[PDB]
């Protein structure tokens, strides 16, 4: 007997400046929605558009592929929730893809001990960018941070790696096991989640 409560578009994020997705949640304290319709228009156009892809981002999502995504242009979007009894509209959301960039974690993190001749031995860390980021043209710029700690230490040690995809750490505790992770952010935007940890045993003769 109730129309839906007021929905809310609570997040948008772009993993690479080329596509983005947004997510909404149904309001509580209304009836169950049988359909949602997300519509939007853009700065400087009057045309209204519907969400072009309700599938790719999973449940309650709108995914904007490359042909629908641009930078430096405000999207003004809203989602309506409807059932047989009535309908309800979210607040309008103003979104610029420029400001919601958050990459996926770096890939292929690998760690090694290297002990060369009368040069300090070191831990050698290596990784790769997330896939589908276009760094080679300079369209995207990625910055990386490493963290590492032994089990039971109260603090992580953090190392800024800038734009490198390998790094050397010198002051390790001989004999200790370390958990190592890596994360990345665009030049301007949000840090990714940390990658899955890799583990390394530092040998005794360090």
């Amino acid at each position: 007997m109730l129309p839906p409560g007021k929905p809310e578009i609570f997040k948008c994020r772009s993993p690479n400046k080329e596509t983005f997705t947004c997510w909404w949640r149904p309001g509580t304290d209304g009836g169950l929605p049988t359909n949602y319709s997300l519509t939007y228009h853009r700065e400087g156009e009057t045309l209204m558009h519907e969400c072009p892809d309700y599938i790719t981002g999973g449940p309650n999502s709108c995914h904007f592929g490359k042909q629908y995504t641009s930078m430096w242009r405000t999207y003004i979007m809203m989602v309506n929730a409807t059932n047989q009894m009535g309908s309800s509209f979210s607040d309008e959301l103003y979104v610029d893809v420029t400001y919601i960039v958050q990459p996926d974690p770096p890939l292929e993190l690998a760690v090694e001990v290297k002990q060369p001749e009368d040069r300090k031995p070191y831990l050698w860390i290596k990784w790769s960018p997330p896939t589908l980021i276009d760094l080679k043209t300079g369209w995207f710029t990625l910055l990386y941070e490493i963290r590492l700690k032994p089990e039971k230490a109260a603090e992580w040690e953090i190392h800024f790696a800038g734009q490198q995809t390998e790094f050397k750490i010198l002051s390790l505790h001989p004999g200790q096991k370390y958990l190592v992770q890596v994360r990345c952010k665009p030049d301007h935007g949000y840090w990714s989640a940390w990658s899955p940890a890799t583990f390394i045993q530092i040998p005794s003769d360090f």
Binding site: K17, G44, T69, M71, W72, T98, T137, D187, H188
Partner: protein
């Protein structure tokens, strides 16, 4: 020596972009946080009329000489509003120190970037027609209004537009560095 110029230009652009973003956030949180300023920002930027690439493919379609000259026109067009932003704010008896400080550095750093870009154009395209055309900003009376809400809205829009154009110029310069120096193998 292209590589030193490009590295310096990109340091300056990335630094300006970051400062403009922090300035806009501080102004937003202090003066506009609760209100419909964002709705009045829509379509308010003096550089909108310019034909600018809006995604990677459009950027890739734009030849380098037009691309460089695009960046230069954008930067030249911001000299006037940045000068008046700093003048207007510095002449207020109780100016926000964190806001004023950023505006003054963006004003001085934008000049240095434009000087680097003029050097880059002379090295890479030594015989272009020296052609000055860029969009005119003329929003000074609105920064000057006695109405506090109209005033803060005009400032909001200028700082929103500055955050956008600085990010954009930084991104275009990073693309061009990769294209010109590295054949798109950064």
């Amino acid at each position: 020596m292209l590589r030193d110029l490009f590295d310096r230009a990109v340091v300056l652009s990335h630094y300006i972009a970051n400062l403009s973003s922090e300035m806009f956030s501080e102004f937003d949180k202090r003066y506009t946080h609760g209100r419909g300023f964002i709705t009045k920002a829509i379509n308010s930027c003096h550089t909108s009329s310019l034909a600018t690439p809006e995604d990677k493919e459009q950027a890739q379609q734009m030849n380098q000489k037009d691309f460089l000259s695009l960046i230069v026109s954008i930067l030249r067009s911001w000299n006037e509003p940045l000068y008046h932003l700093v003048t207007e704010v510095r002449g207020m008896q109780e100016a926000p120190e964190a806001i004023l400080s950023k505006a003054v550095e963006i004003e001085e750093q934008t000049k240095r970037l434009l000087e680097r870009m003029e050097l880059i154009v002379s090295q890479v395209h030594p015989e272009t027609k020296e052609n000055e055309i860029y969009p005119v900003w003329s929003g000074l009376p609105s920064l000057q209004m006695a109405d506090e809400e109209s005033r803060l809205s005009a400032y909001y829009n200028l700082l929103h537009c500055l955050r956008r154009d600085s990010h954009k110029i930084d991104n275009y310069l990073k693309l061009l560095k990769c294209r010109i120096i590295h054949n798109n193998n950064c």
